[PDB]
Amino acid sequence: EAIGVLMMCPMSTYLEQELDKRFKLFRYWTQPAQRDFLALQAESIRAVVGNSNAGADAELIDALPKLEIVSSFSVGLDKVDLIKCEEKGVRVTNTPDVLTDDVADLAIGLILAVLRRICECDKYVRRGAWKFGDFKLTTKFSGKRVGIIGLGRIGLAVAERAEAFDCPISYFSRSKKPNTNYTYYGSVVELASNSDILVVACPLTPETTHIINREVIDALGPKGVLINIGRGPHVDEPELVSALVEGRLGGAGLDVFEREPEVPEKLFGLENVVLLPHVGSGTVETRKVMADLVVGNLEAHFSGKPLLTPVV
Amino acid sequence: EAIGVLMMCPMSTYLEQELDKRFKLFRYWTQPAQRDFLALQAESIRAVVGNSNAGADAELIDALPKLEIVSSFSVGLDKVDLIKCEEKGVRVTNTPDVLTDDVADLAIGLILAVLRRICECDKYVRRGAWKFGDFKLTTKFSGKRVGIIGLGRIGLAVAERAEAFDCPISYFSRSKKPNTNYTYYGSVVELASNSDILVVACPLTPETTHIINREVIDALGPKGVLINIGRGPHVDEPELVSALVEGRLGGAGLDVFEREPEVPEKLFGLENVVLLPHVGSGTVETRKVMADLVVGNLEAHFSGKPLLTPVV
Numbered sequence: 001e002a003i004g005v006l007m008m009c010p011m012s013t014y015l016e017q018e019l020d021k022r023f024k025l026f027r028y029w030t031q032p033a034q035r036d037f038l039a040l041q042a043e044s045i046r047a048v049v050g051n052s053n054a055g056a057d058a059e060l061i062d063a064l065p066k067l068e069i070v071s072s073f074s075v076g077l078d079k080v081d082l083i084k085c086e087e088k089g090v091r092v093t094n095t096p097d098v099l100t101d102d103v104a105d106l107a108i109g110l111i112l113a114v115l116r117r118i119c120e121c122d123k124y125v126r127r128g129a130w131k132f133g134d135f136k137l138t139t140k141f142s143g144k145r146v147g148i149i150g151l152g153r154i155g156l157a158v159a160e161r162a163e164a165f166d167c168p169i170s171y172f173s174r175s176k177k178p179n180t181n182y183t184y185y186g187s188v189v190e191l192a193s194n195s196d197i198l199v200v201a202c203p204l205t206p207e208t209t210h211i212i213n214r215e216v217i218d219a220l221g222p223k224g225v226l227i228n229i230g231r232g233p234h235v236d237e238p239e240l241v242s243a244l245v246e247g248r249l250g251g252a253g254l255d256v257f258e259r260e261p262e263v264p265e266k267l268f269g270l271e272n273v274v275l276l277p278h279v280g281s282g283t284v285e286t287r288k289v290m291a292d293l294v295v296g297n298l299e300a301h302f303s304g305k306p307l308l309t310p311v312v
Numbered sequence: 313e314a315i316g317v318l319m320m321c322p323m324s325t326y327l328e329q330e331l332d333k334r335f336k337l338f339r340y341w342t343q344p345a346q347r348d349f350l351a352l353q354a355e356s357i358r359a360v361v362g363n364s365n366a367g368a369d370a371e372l373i374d375a376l377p378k379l380e381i382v383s384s385f386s387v388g389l390d391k392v393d394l395i396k397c398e399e400k401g402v403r404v405t406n407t408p409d410v411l412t413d414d415v416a417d418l419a420i421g422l423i424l425a426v427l428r429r430i431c432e433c434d435k436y437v438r439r440g441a442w443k444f445g446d447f448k449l450t451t452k453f454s455g456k457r458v459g460i461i462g463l464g465r466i467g468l469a470v471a472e473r474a475e476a477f478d479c480p481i482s483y484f485s486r487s488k489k490p491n492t493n494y495t496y497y498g499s500v501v502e503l504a505s506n507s508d509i510l511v512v513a514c515p516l517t518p519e520t521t522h523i524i525n526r527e528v529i530d531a532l533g534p535k536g537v538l539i540n541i542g543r544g545p546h547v548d549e550p551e552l553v554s555a556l557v558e559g560r561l562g563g564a565g566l567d568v569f570e571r572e573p574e575v576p577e578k579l580f581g582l583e584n585v586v587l588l589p590h591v592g593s594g595t596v597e598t599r600k601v602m603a604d605l606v607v608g609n610l611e612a613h614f615s616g617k618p619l620l621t622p623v624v
Contacts, residue, residue, distance in 0.1 A: 101454040105477065109430055112421030116595075119431045121588045126580040130573040130589040140595040142413040164476035165417065261442040268438040276433045277442040283428075283452040 003302055004044040006064070008054035011073050015291035019049065022295065028054075038063045047071060047298055052231070052278075053260075055079025061088055069301045071294045075099055077311060078204040078231065085312050092312040093297040095290045097153065099281035104157035106280050107199055107229045110253025111162075113274045114225050115139040115197075120271050142166050147195030149188060149211060150202025151177050154229070158199055170194060188212075192219035197227060204231040214239040217249050225251040229280050232258035241266055244273060255280050315614055316356040318376070320366035323385050327603035331361065334607065340366075350375045359383060359610055364543070364590075365572075367391025373400055381613045383606045387411055389623060390516040390543065397624050404624040405609040407602045409465065411593035416469035418592050419511055419541045422565025423474075425586045426537050427451040427509075432583050454478050459507030461500060461523060462514025463489050466541070470511055482506060500524075504531035509539060516543040526551040529561050537563040541592050544570035553578055556585060567592050 002024040007016065009029050019025045026045065031037040038060075045064050048056045051073040058081045061067055069091040070080055077094055085092050113119055117138045124135055142165040148155045151171045159169045159182060170183040172191045177184070185191040188211055192198050198220050202208050212226065212235040220226060226249060228235060237258040243249040244267070251272035257263050260278055267273050281287065297308050314336040319328065321341050331337045338357065343349040350372075357376050360368045363385040370393045373379055381403040382392055389406055397404050425431055429450045436447055454477040460467045463483045471481045471494060482495040484503045489496070497503040500523055504510050510532050514520050524538065524547040532538060538561060540547060549570040555561040556579070563584035569575050572590055579585050593599065609620050 101478070102452055105424060105453050106428060109421065109424030109428055112417060113425060113430050113434075116418060116421055116591065118421055118425050118586065118588065119434045121591055122425075122431045122586050123435075125575055125587040125589055130575065134573075135589045135591060135594070137594055137596045137599055138591065140414055140597045141417050161476045164473045166413070261446075263437055263442065274430065274434050275437040276430065277437055277447045279428065279433055279447060279450065282447070282449055284449045285452045287449055 003046050004041065005047045005049060005298065006041070006045045007049045008056075009051060011049075011051040011053075012287055012291050014288060015049070015073060015294060018291060018295050019298075023047075023298070042066070047301070049073060049294060049298075050079055052076050052079060055081075056085070057081050058084045061085065061090065069093070069298065071297045071301075073290055073294050076203055076231070082312050090312070091301060091307060091310060093294075093307055093309050094311055095293050096309055098289045098293060099286050100153045100157050102283050102286045103154050103229050103280040104161060106255060106276070107158045107201070107227050107253075108161050110227050110229070110255065110274055110276070111197055111225070112141055114227075114251045114253045114272065115141050115144075117271070119274055141197075144196040145170065145194060147171065147185075147191045147198045149191070149198065149200050149208075150230075151180065151182070152202065155199070155201035158201055167197075188216050189219045192216045192224070195220060195224060197225050199227040200230040200234045202230060202234075204233060209233050210236045212236065212240065214243070217243045220249060222247055223250045225249075225253065227253045229255045232256045232260055237264065244270055315358050316353065317359045317361060317610065318353070318357045319361045320368075321363060323361075323363040323365075324599055324603050326600060327361070327385060327606060330603060330607050331610075335359075335610070354378070359613070361385060361606060361610075362391055364388050364391060367393075368397070369393050370396045373397065373402065381405070381610065383609045383613075385602055385606050388515055388543070394624050402624070403613060403619060403622060405606075405619055405621050406623055407605050408621055410601045410605060411598050412465045412469050414595050414598045415466050415541050415592040416473060418567060418588070419470045419513070419539050419565075420473050422539050422541070422567065422586055422588070423509055423537070424453055426539075426563045426565045426584065427453050427456075429583070431586055453509075456508040457482065457506060459483065459497075459503045459510045461503070461510065461512050461520075462542075463492065463494070464514065467511070467513035470513055479509075500528050501531045504528045504536070507532060507536060509537050511539040512542040512546045514542060514546075516545060521545050522548045524548065524552065526555070529555045532561060534559055535562045537561075537565065539565045541567045544568045544572055549576065556582055 005023040006026045006028055046066050046068045048070045056070045061084050067090050071093045075096050121135055146162045146167040148171040151173050172185050172188050241264050253274045255276045256278050300307050317335040318338045318340055358378050358380045360382045368382045373396050379402050383405045387406055387408050433447055458474045458479040460483040463485050484497050484500050553576050565586045567588045568590050612619050
């Protein structure tokens with residue numbers, strides 16, 4: 001008797017293939033009458049596969065009375081109601097550690113792309129402009145002060161890369177890390193005031209929602225650069241756009257947006273931003289590992305074996 | 313009696329200003345009849361200021377019988393005839409060490425921009441394409457094999473950054489460096505065969521001209537990426553373009569071109585290249601240091617003090 005798995009959104013061709021080979025795969029996003037569909041399949045669905053864009057909230061869990069496990073194709077779990085899962089005996093797994101390096105790599109790539117205007121330079125060459133003069137001078141990365149919001153796995157990986165560019169490292173966390181030689185700040189504003197580059201690298205929770213607000217942006221200031229590889233709602237996005245347009249923030253390298261895949265179009269005209277479509281973990285190598293980990297958690301669950309990467 | 317200084321090309325607004333304040337500045341590139349001009353000023357010019365695009369060859373030195381010093385706004389000196397300067401008692405200075413970090417930073421920025429398709433991603437977002445689907449999966453940098461051609465100051469700086477991304481490092485040099493823990497190869501082809509990313513980081517000499525030839529490119533192969541932060545003539549450029557067009561090379565991040573600022577237009581259509589207008593040292597901070605070093609060498613020379621950064 002084949003096991004019903006509801007995949008919430010089209011997150012990975014490979015994963016879809018691997019789930020379809022093993023389970024009774026339902027693709028939620030293809031159903032034209034989704035609530036009708038959940039009623040029809042209430043007794044058949046035993047697992048949900050989510051990602052950072054679509055998870056499992058209380059209403060979905062309530063709608064899936066035979067739900068046993070939510071396996072997320074993500075390290076973050078802001079789209080899963082953990083409290084509710086625990087309350088219902090539903091297991092939750094994620095994909096820890098396996099995307100750390102790619103996300104940290106992208107932070108450094110964004111830094112260089114903004115400070116050295118790599119994307120602008122490449123556009124300049126392809127329109128033939130180099131034949132009429134050199135590109136403007138840009139900004140040195142090595143030696144600049146890098147502030148990091150969050151010093152968990154991804155924040156540490158960013159720090160360790162930036163140290164190789166001779167960047168002094170500072171960070172904010174709820175509590176100081178005793179383990180580290182970096183400079184601890186007890187305030188995001190004070191951190192920002194003392195950073196040339198500010199990197200958002202923490203999970204999204206109520207508490208960290210809009211952790212980059214207007215006051216933080218203005219403290220980072222006209223010669224500072226914001227790097228967001230976290231989540232869009234970490235930033236008060238309309239205030240970020242205003243600050244960029246008005247010269248109050250020096251630049252921004254953004255992988256994530258508050259209402260992605262919508263990106264404020266005013267940003268498209270700005271040479272001091274780099275805008276990416278949430279590609280932090282988006283490599284062939286890392287997505288394969290993540291997909292295999294989702295499958296491996298589901299196979300362990302339905303075979304009575306300990307889970308690989310449980311959270312709840 | 314003001315001292316004649318011939319500046320060969322328009323390399324730096326700041327430097328031009330600083331030379332104009334101190335010396336009798338001649339701007340060679342503004343003269344409509346240059347050979348007439350050199351005749352007119354043969355007795356007045358005591359210094360030449362060059363860069364990587366225009367230096368001082370034998371004919372110019374012969375044309376400047378009162379020449380005492382050639383101060384280059386560059387670390388490289390391929391555009392200066394050192395042999396001839398030595399023969400004539402002409403001093404030569406350059407700008408060592410001060411651009412190492414920016415050039416090495418740009419190599420890493422090019423690597424990330426190519427492998428993670430940062431420029432392509434940014435173009436994709438700005439044309440609105442994210443509303444219709446996600447960007448393709450790209451290639452992880454961390455852990456990939458980085459081969460470096462040259463292990464002098466810039467090559468070492470590239471290596472040390474790449475090690476922070478967990479990249480195994482290999483290099484080619486005329487002789488093995490006993491100092492290092494990296495993997496030495498005695499052949500550029502063998503290096504290329506064992507690299508995911510191949511970085512050109514050596515001076516340009518006859519011997520290193522076209523050190524990246526078709527055989528090297530094919531050994532790097534369809535999944536390899538070439539990074540050139542050296543000089544354009546390090547590569548057999550028509551063979552590089554063919555290899556990219558035909559799928560025989562995986563990608564390329566290029567700061568320098570054989571006939572810059574001409575860039576083969578066939579490259580403009582390729583998504584697997586990143587093309588920059590020779591911006592390796594092109595930051596406000598580093599160019600100021602370089603300019604001040606040129607001025608400081610000239611002031612030392614004409615005041616009878618030891619030079620700052622002599623080569624000859």
